[PDB]
């Protein structure tokens, strides 16, 4: 929430609304560790990144193996005062953020700035839905990283079985969002077809040598 001084400065200056350059990554069907390493290096290089759909990351192996690994992690606590001990976060976005934090140099101001440059969500929230197209990391995708015969696990199911009470909430919100987007995209089909037809028809009216150059370069 902005302060009244910040609002007054903005009003007095009169400049228009500003948004910095932010990359939004759709993390569905990505390998957790490879995605974390790539994102950590980009954060250190100076990018602002927002990751969505953190509950559909992938890990290799069976859910039972990965759940046993998490329980072993959860067993560690400072015996003398557990309120100081390690804090075990159960949500998939917190799991991703902790993996990245362990891949960063966290006890330095530079590493702290890098870690604060990252935002993580489950699903796609309304303040992110309409900001532009999402990206993928092609060198960290499951269909090219795992052999197809081997089993794998989805982060949401494992996190649900170790804690994380909000799986059903996220599922309902995602279903509603996809329904709304599907309705909107079913609309505008006529407009898209009209623009495609206009593009096809303009060739008959533009100059012939321009058409020839387009055909030569393959934009025909």
């Amino acid at each position: 929430f902005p302060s009244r001084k910040d609002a007054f400065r903005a009003q007095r200056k009169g400049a228009k609304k500003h948004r910095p350059e932010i990359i939004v990554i759709d993390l569905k069907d990505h390998v957790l560790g490879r995605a974390a390493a790539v994102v950590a290096k980009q954060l250190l290089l100076g990018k602002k990144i927002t990751v969505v759909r953190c509950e559909q990351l992938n890990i290799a192996g069976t859910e039972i193996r990965n759940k046993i690994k998490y329980l072993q992690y959860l067993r560690k606590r400072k015996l003398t005062n557990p309120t100081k001990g390690p804090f075990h976060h159960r949500a998939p976005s917190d799991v991703f953020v902790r993996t990245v934090r362990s891949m960063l140099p966290r006890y330095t101001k530079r590493g702290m700035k890098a870690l604060n440059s990252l935002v993580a969500y489950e699903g796609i929230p309304p303040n992110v839905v309409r900001t532009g197209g999402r990206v993928v990391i092609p060198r960290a995708q499951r269909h090219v990283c795992y052999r197809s015969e081997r089993p794998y696990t989805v982060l949401g199911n494992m996190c649900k079985h170790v804690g994380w009470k909000y799986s059903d909430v996220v599922a309902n919100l995602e279903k509603a969002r996809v329904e709304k987007a599907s309705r909107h995209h079913e609309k505008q089909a006529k407009l898209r077809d009209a623009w495609k037809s206009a593009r096809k028809e303009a060739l008959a009216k533009m100059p012939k040598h321009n058409v020839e150059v387009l055909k030569k370069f393959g934009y025909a």
């Binding site: 009209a194 623009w195 206009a198 593009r199 028809e201 303009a202 060739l203 009216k205 533009m206 100059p207 321009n210 058409v211 150059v213 387009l214 030569k216 370069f217 393959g218 934009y219």
Partner: protein, 119 residues
């Protein structure tokens, strides 16, 4: 999907002979094949890995059989060959040609806008 078989036409993906078309003349093993093409000067008989080929939809069944099949003409006619030639054209281009392409695209966009408004 297109199968790997004797006489099948393939395109090379990477390497010094990339974006070239040849014919499979012998299956050495699960990973390697022998490729030749009399038409191309650089495509004499050699060994290629199967990670470096893309099968096409033509299979002759050597120079006489290839000429009779006329798969080279069909490949020249399809849209992939057009894309490859356009990529080579874009690669070898000058500032003047880039300017000409820019004005052609701007002309097409303007006329598309006019047609859309008219309709």
């Amino acid at each position: 999907s297109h199968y790997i078989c004797a006489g099948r036409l393939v395109r090379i993906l990477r390497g010094p002979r990339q974006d070239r078309v040849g014919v499979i003349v012998d299956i050495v093993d699960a990973n390697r094949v022998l490729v030749e093409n009399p038409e191309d000067a650089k495509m004499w008989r050699h060994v290629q890995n199967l990670k470096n080929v893309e099968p096409l939809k033509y299979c002759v069944s050597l120079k006489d059989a290839l000429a009779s099949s006329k798969a080279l003409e069909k490949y020249a006619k399809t849209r992939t060959a057009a894309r490859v030639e356009a990529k080579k054209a874009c690669a070898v281009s000058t500032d003047f040609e880039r300017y000409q392409l820019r004005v052609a695209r701007r002309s097409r966009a303007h006329w598309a806008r006019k047609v859309f408004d008219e309709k």
